[PDB]
Amino acid sequence: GTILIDLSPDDKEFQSVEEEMQSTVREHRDGGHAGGIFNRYNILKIQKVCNKKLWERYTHRRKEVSEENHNHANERMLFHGSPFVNAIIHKGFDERHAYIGGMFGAGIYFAENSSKSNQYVYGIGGGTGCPVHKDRSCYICHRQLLFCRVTLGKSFLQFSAM
Amino acid sequence: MAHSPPGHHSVTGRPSVNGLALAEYVIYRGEQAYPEYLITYQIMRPE
Numbered sequence: 001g002t003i004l005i006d007l008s009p010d011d012k013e014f015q016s017v018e019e020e021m022q023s024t025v026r027e028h029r030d031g032g033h034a035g036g037i038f039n040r041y042n043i044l045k046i047q048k049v050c051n052k053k054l055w056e057r058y059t060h061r062r063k064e065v066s067e068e069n070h071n072h073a074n075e076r077m078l079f080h081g082s083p084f085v086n087a088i089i090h091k092g093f094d095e096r097h098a099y100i101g102g103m104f105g106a107g108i109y110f111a112e113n114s115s116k117s118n119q120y121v122y123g124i125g126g127g128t129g130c131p132v133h134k135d136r137s138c139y140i141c142h143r144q145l146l147f148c149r150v151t152l153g154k155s156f157l158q159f160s161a162m
Numbered sequence: 163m164a165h166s167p168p169g170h171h172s173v174t175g176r177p178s179v180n181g182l183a184l185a186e187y188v189i190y191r192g193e194q195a196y197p198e199y200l201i202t203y204q205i206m207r208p209e
């Protein structure tokens with residue numbers, strides 16, 4: 001079902017997506033242990049993910065949530081990093097993309113800081129890092145994350161000592 | 163997979179100690195997210 005369309009670096013859409021990635025890097029309290037040591041990225045490619053079935057599934061749930069929350073889907077764009085990005089783009093998010101041991105329960109996690117999602121690209125806590133060099137701070141290997149459309153509806157506010 | 167607290171659709175994890183960390187969010191249904199952009203990248207070694 002899925003087709004991937006390359007965006008041109010001269011297109012304003014590419015440029016706005018890169019700006020979201022780059023502007024939401026921060027330092028992490030682990031010193032870079034999980035995700036590596038960096039202040040910015042080299043963006044190599046940005047692809048638009050197109051799948052009519054998955055889209056209609058999303059927008060059907062979106063309208064349900066809107067109607068339960070004073071006509072406000074509370075839709076955001078957020079980052080998701082994991083080793084399963086290739087399954088997500090063909091089959092969608094599901095229970096097998098849940099962080100069963102996460103702070104807020106077994107669910108699917110997203111971040112406003114692109115650098116937070118980067119800590120999960122090679123696994124929980126960065127796993128053992130890249131496949132080729134076993135290096136969580138690899139400057140060579142190509143990484144992938146998703147910039148996702150996410151419906152929050154009425155969101156329970158949980159203040160977190162983090 | 164867990165469920166949202168009753169009467170809610172998601173959880174917002176708002177960091178209270180580090181005032182530069184932005185929010186994290188959890189959903190409990192896969193159909194509440196669409197993977198719109200696939201970004202391929204390298205992290206860069208600082209100078």
Ligand SMILES: O=c1cc(-c2ccc(O)c(O)c2)oc2cc(O)cc(O)c12
Pocket residue numbers: 079080081082083084096097098099100102109110111116117120123124186
């Ligand atoms: O992108 C995130 C991805 C994941 C994640 C964690 C465990 C998994 O088995 C998985 O498939 C994904 O966990 C997070 C946990 C966070 O607190 C913030 C995040 O952005 C993520």
Ligand SMILES: [Zn+2]
Pocket residue numbers: 130131132133134135138139140141
């Ligand atoms: Zn590597």
